[PDB]
Every structure is written in C-alpha cells, then in structure tokens.
Design a protein around this ligand. Sequence first.
Ligand SMILES: N[C@@H](Cc1ccccc1)C(=O)O
Ligand SMILES: N[C@@H](Cc1ccccc1)C(=O)O
Lengths: 350, 350
Amino acid sequence: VVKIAVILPMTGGISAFGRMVWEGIQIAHEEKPTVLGEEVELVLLDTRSEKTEAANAAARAIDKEKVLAIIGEVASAHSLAIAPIAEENKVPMVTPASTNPLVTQGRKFVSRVCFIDPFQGAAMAVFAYKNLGAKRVVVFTDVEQDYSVGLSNFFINKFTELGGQVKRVFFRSGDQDFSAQLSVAMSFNPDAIYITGYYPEIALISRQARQLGFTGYILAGDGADAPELIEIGGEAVEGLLFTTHYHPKAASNPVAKKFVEVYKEKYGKEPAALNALGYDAYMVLLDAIERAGSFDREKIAEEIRKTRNFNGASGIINIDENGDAIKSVVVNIVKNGSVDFEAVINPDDL
Amino acid sequence: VVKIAVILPMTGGISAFGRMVWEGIQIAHEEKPTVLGEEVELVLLDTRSEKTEAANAAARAIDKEKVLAIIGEVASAHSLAIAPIAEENKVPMVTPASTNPLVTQGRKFVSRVCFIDPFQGAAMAVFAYKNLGAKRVVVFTDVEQDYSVGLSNFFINKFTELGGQVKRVFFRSGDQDFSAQLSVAMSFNPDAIYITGYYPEIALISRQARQLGFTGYILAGDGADAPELIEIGGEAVEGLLFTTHYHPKAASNPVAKKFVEVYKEKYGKEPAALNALGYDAYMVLLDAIERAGSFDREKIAEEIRKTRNFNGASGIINIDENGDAIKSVVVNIVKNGSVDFEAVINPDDL
Ligand SMILES: N[C@@H](Cc1ccccc1)C(=O)O
Ligand SMILES: N[C@@H](Cc1ccccc1)C(=O)O
C-alpha cells in the first residue's frame, strides 16, 4: 500500500542510465520487498530523457499517485526539475546518481547516495595535473546539461589553481558533428581533452578527435560510465579515463561483495556504478523508514540525513546534514573493450 | 584602449531584451565615454539568444579581446553560461537584469544591479494572495530557462506558505501550442495562471488561455517586460499583471528623472526597465573603476560590491556583499495597449 515513485530515463538519449539504475533497484526490492511490515510498491515512471517529462512525472507521482517517496533521477538537469516539486510537497527524494550540488542545496527533503561535483571535478583536475602531467586541457561542456556546466566549472577552478591552462568549447546534447569545437581544441595544442557531458556525445567526440590525429588523453566524468560508451566509441575510447563512483573489483564491505555476486548471477557480467547506486538509493530509503518507525514523511526525511556507517553496494554510505554522501571518486580506464580500475581518490587526498 | 564586452541577445528569440539594454548602455556611454582619463571602448557581442553562443562570446571576449570587464547577459541561463568564465579569469562582470541567485552565488567577480528571484517570486506570491485574493494558481514553467525554473520555485514556496494551492505545468522556449498545459490548467479551476518564462511564450499562452474562455488573472515575472508582449498578445494580455524593476512614472531620484527625459527625447516613448538597467550596469561599473583608482581587476571587482547610495536610472543602487542589489519590485499592468504602474513592493512589505 506503500508507494515509491521510481523516476528514471528508461527511453530516449540517456536510456542506458535508466536501465542500469532500474536493474539495481529491482535487485534491492526483491531482497527487501517490505518495510515496517508493509508491502512496498514501486511506481516506475519514464522521463524519456526529457526535462519536461521528468517534471511531469514528478508532478503526477505527487498529485495523482500520492507516493510516499521518490527515487530518481540520474541526470542532474532532470533531478533539478523534480527536486523542487518533492520539496514543495514534503515528499522525501533520494537520487542515486545526480552529482550537481544544487539538487540538495537549501532543501530538507532531497538527498543523494553519491558524491557531489566540486569533489568529482577537483579529483580529475588533480589526477590530470599530478598523475598524467597534463598542463593544457580543452574542456568540452554540454550547455544543455546542468551537470556538465557545473562539473566543467569545478574542474577548471581546481585545474587552473594548480597552474594548468584551459580552453573552453561548447556543444549541445544531441549534436553529431564536433568539427568546429575540435578545430578550436586542437589549435590550443592540448595534452588532454576533458568532456563533461554524457556517453552519446563523449563517444562521438572521441571518434572525431582520434580521426583528426589527436594522440593526447581523453578524460571525462561519470557521464561516460555506460557500456554504450565502448559500443559507440570502439578503438577511439581505448585509454579513455573517467571519474565514477565504483569499480566491482574494488568491492570491499559485505553488502558490496554480495551485490557483485548477485548481479553477476543474474546478468552474466560485472555490475557498474549505476547498478550499485540504484540498489543503495532503495536500501537507504528503506533503512531510513525503519529508523523513523512510521510513514511520517518529515521523520523519514530527517532519518535519510542521519544515515551513517551504512554498508551499501557502492561503498559505506554516510550522508551529511546537506543530504550529500561522503564518497570516494574512482578513476577507471577503458582497456581492451572493457573497464579497468585505475585509482581511488578519497576526499583527504586533495 | 579600455575595452568593455557588452554581451547581449541582439538577435534570436529574446532579441527585444538586447535591444532595450543596448539603448540604455549607449545613452550611458555617450554621457560618460571615458574613465580615469581613458577612452572606453564597447565591444558588442551578440549571443543570438543561445546558451552556446553566449558562452562562446564570453570565451572570445576574455581569450581574444582581452577585455577589462563584461556587461551582460539578460537571460539568467545565458548569464549562468558566462559567469563561470568571468570568474575563472578574474574579469569583473555586471549583469543588468539576470535575477537568478546562482549568477553571483559563490563568486567574487560577478555582480548585478537588480533584485534576485527569491524576492521577485515572493513579491508576486504575496500580491496574488493578499491583493488579488488568488488562492488557486497554475504555474507555467519553461524547463529550458534557469530563470523560469527558479522563479517558479520561489513563487510556489511563498504562495503555498501563505496557504495557496498550486498546480504545475511545463513547456519549452520556442513552443507554439500550449493546448495540453492549458487543458491541465483549466481542470484545476484556477483564479490565476502565473507564467515564469519570456514574452514570446507568455503572449502565446495568454492568447490561447483567453480563447479557451479563461477569465481569471494572468500573472508573469519580468520576462513579460518587452513591448513585444503587447504586440503579440493584443487583447489577450489586457489586464495582465507582472513584476518588474521599474516604471518611468515612478522615477524619483535626479538621475532617474533625467534618464526619462533623455530617453523620451531620443525615442519618443517612455523608457522601460531594461533601458534603465542597461544604463545602470554601465554607470555602476565606471563608478567602481573610479573608486578603484586604477584598472586592477581585483580592485574593480571589490569596488562593485561596495556600491552604496548610487543614484541610478532604475532607482538607488546598493549592492550587497554577495553582488546582489537591494531593489524594490514594481508590479505593472497592461491597460489599453500600454503599461501602467500598479504597485511597489519594498523588501520590508513582506
Ligand atoms: N552524475 C551524473 C549522472 C550519472 C551518474 C553516474 C553515472 C552516469 C551518470 C549527473 O549528475 O548528471
Ligand atoms: N530577470 C530575467 C531577465 C529579464 C529582466 C528584466 C526584463 C526582462 C527580462 C532573467 O533573469 O532571465
């Protein structure tokens, strides 16, 4: 009788993200289908990878479906469309994977189980400058995506604070031709390009950059982290380095090791960050409901922000008083058509 | 030899805004063409009403043109595209008219001469509820515009805090057909619709709403404030109420009264908010340069944030330590094909 809206991009341009989160949520829900002795019903609502439809879905979840809570979205732009709707109506929301700070900032009811972009940006800035010796970087920003605009800003602040130099170019979600931007990019004689958009554009930029003769590093954020990156990119994304939340071979706590084996058994492949993050969004929400001891939405919201030492699939989850999780950045690299662990950057290493 | 980039939408969907700001900047520059004994050169850069091109223009202003400072943009989305570029490169920026808080938040080099949207939203929420007796409002949000998304949030927080009820619908910049949203809107039996987008969509929503038989209030924000609203809207925008920054008949201080007479002499019509705001962005920047006593960008940035008791065309300008101006909201109304003063809401009246 307890309903939880699951608001995800199951179709459209970033549909891989909805698939990956849903797979993890489904595993969690099969494991823990009830809370406080009541059956939990998931209400899956497809955003179609659109801002308007994310907003519409959240409006309907609250006005029509009368949900207790919301899990979603993935793209920061889409979570930003719905976070105000959740807050205005005092409906607890947990995003598995939106990293832009503004999702939770100034809100009580909206929280996340992942890191935020000041850290994700700073981490790649340090990695690039210190570990790769990159000094000249062309940063490609997707102007349509709040996630991209923010991450680029946070990377650039740190990279230039370190003494690096940057050139900025701009594109839109949906673009197929990056000739103008790559022409500007190459004239800067970069050591690396850093792309803060999502896998469809990252893959196409990478093919076009390599076709041009670019032999430097291609770097990206967590937007890269879908197997589709490799499916589209092929050889052009070999050696691509990206920040994300997770690598299955790094699983350490017992819930994380178990999630690897359960996911492997069902799917015949290693899980990825968004699988683990989906599982954690669900389990954290239900853990919070149990601590609240009732279905009072204000107490549930309060308890989400008191989550401490929680063994999650994606790591140990600690949620701060702003609704942001204290989590490590994982740097991964594409090698031979799959994803290898490269490094872990904990908050203190910066 | 001193160059100031003026980054405005001179063409595209919101071109009226660039025209109106430019007219005011041109008046200011003719009045005060030099600073610290040096000639000021304006570098006009057209954003074409696009996020990508706003970003490109700012990148070129800084990388290629080596400007001292930037005046612009108007749309919060476009100012948000460029504010990080200004900040990263320590180039002082003054927006005449972007109201979204995030433009200046967490930055030292970016400031504005206008109010911010927590106040603009709250002001219409109080006006609607207390003055118009509106209790049921359908809020139309343009999902593509950071300005709209923010203002809608701020209006709704205050309107519902007062006890009002809201239904949310969603559209995109460029849309021509609002039948789906108006159908949802009317089923809520609203006393008013409040549209937080720009004049092109506000006008079309208004025609379609009236054609449907809607006899309630149509309310909007400062996005309404272009004569094009009336040119497109006709009878359908009669009685439309909107928040803005200014009314020429309210001019009070001597710089504001003079600006009215100078603008009238040149153009044969009363000035509007964006004319006055353009003039003020320029005069405030030059006032700050004079107080700095040199072309040191850090000192100029510091002085912009110390502006106090400055007689501007748009009112007395006081800029806080966050780069936000303490300014009053003006409520105007369309009557007989022109704009009448309806009320002033000072910060304390809330
Ligand atoms: N962090 C990205 C979403 C994302 C997370 C993890 C993997 C892929 C995508 C955002 O906020 O938009
Ligand atoms: N305040 C609007 C811009 C605007 C101001 C004044 C008049 C018209 C438009 C924004 O931030 O996008």
